Design a protein around this ligand. Sequence first.
Ligand SMILES: [Mg+2]
Lengths: 111, 69, 79, 115, 217, 50
Amino acid sequence: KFDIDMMVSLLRQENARDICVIQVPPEMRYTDYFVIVSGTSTRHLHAMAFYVVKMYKHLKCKRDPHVKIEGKDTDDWLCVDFGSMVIHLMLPETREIYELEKLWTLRSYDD
Amino acid sequence: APWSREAVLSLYRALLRQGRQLRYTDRDFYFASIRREFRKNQKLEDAEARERQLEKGLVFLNGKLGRII
Amino acid sequence: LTLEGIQDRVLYVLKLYDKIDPEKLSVNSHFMKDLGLDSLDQVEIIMAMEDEFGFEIPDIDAEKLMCPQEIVDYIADKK
Amino acid sequence: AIQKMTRVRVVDNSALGNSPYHRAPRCIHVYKKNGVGKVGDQILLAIKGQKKKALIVGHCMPGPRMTPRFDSNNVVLIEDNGNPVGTRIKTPIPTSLRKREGEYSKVLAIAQNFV
Amino acid sequence: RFLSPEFIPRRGRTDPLKFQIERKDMLERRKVLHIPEFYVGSILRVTTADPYASGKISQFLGICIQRSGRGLGATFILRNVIEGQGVEICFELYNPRVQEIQVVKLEKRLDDSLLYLRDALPEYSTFDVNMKPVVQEPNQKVPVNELKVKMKPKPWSKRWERPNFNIKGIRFDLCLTEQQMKEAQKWNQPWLEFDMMREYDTSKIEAAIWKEIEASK
Amino acid sequence: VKDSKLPAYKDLGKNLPFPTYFPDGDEEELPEDLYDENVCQPGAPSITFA
Ligand SMILES: [Mg+2]
């Protein structure tokens, strides 16, 4: 079955430098788990996306719709969204430019 | 200047100690971000925004709008 | 529990901290003037003191120490 | 109906936009075979004497039933490679962007409010 | 004795059997969701299921500006202003996604179609999302709020001062000069209220509709 | 009204009652409303997407 645990273990075992997962309350709309992770080079981020969708495809979700990788044309920010958890691979620079963690922990205002 | 010169200390203590109890995120980068959350803006600024920034720190601690796990 | 061992280990873990300049980290090392640290630095240092041994000292108490030897005595006689 | 020659108000905090300029942003092209553009249809804007890709996130034209009907033709500036130029969004954006395929995941990771 | 407008059918030639099946299915939907009593102008909070999420619940609070349609599809429009942006949503009552409908403030205004709020100043349509209900006495007539409104200046979206709209909830004496109320009154049609043959007499229809609704219990 | 003649539904005339439906066959008499597998029929709990 799918849960944040296995994908986080995937990322850590894949040697992804930084991980930060924020759980979104159901009072919001988008999702439940919202993950921001880093990587070395654009090809390494592409590899992380590769492996994550590979396991998501060979594990389960024959009932559930398939998941596309969004951002391939870009090089410094890639992202995936699943039925209930969404992941954002980012180079450290753009990751610290879009101060996402502050937003997803402090929804009620802007930064 | 702040709502209370010692309240920030308690907030920082609670932030660090609750961050000790993470299950997924790395503790190192969480600690670094927590350091940044006060270091870059909560030094010598005016006495008006102090209330708002203490409020945002404390509501991040509360976490009715997402708990960092 | 050995008091000499206790002070030795707290000194050791303090040495592990990277930013501190190993100039005067004495048994009575002051922070504001001797080293130049501030409230955030000392609260982090005490939390680090609560990283291997301790975990029982309430946060409120730690603000009245502000000196390493009092911290050593407190953590030695509290357990 | 965000078609060619329609004024759209950029709502993204617009590091580029949001600054005074005697013109107002206009759509010069819609990336759909027909001209009409609906939610999620990414268009091209003439803003501050420059050409920049856009992304529609609300329009006054009634849509289906359970989706919002704003009162201003709202647009988010997006860089060519899909990255949003801004870093925030304040005006509400509909939850009808998690639907039909497109470059929408990033634009939801940057907003703060929904309807 | 208030019969929600949906069950009253448009004048036409459709076969009564259609309306009977329509009402049967509707009433069979009213027993899983309480469709409250709300007039145009009331304030509602609608709770629905997000289809594009994984089973999340969405709440939206607004003013019912228009109530139209009939049969199993009829709808109502909720207008509100969020963060200074004026949004509307058209909700279908009998849709199997609306979880519940709280009448947060049951009111009733001078005009049966509050569309002009798209032109009134932004504060005549703003409401707080997290606002609590207000009680009302059971054996009390629905209150008739009297709030005339003040308009955005020049380009009204639908030219409201015409007689054919018959709007009575706008402050015309302020935004329109006395002269403009003489050109906008040559379209009066004094013969339209006295046309005896345009009157849809729906007493004998609402009676049988009540027989059906009560018997469906 | 007649069966679909398009060349993707030539089969699936099997499970239908072949010559016609005779109500007098008396084969587990049919209820008042027959529903497709994927209709949110009335009287059912409001749908949820979890
Ligand atoms: Mg118009």
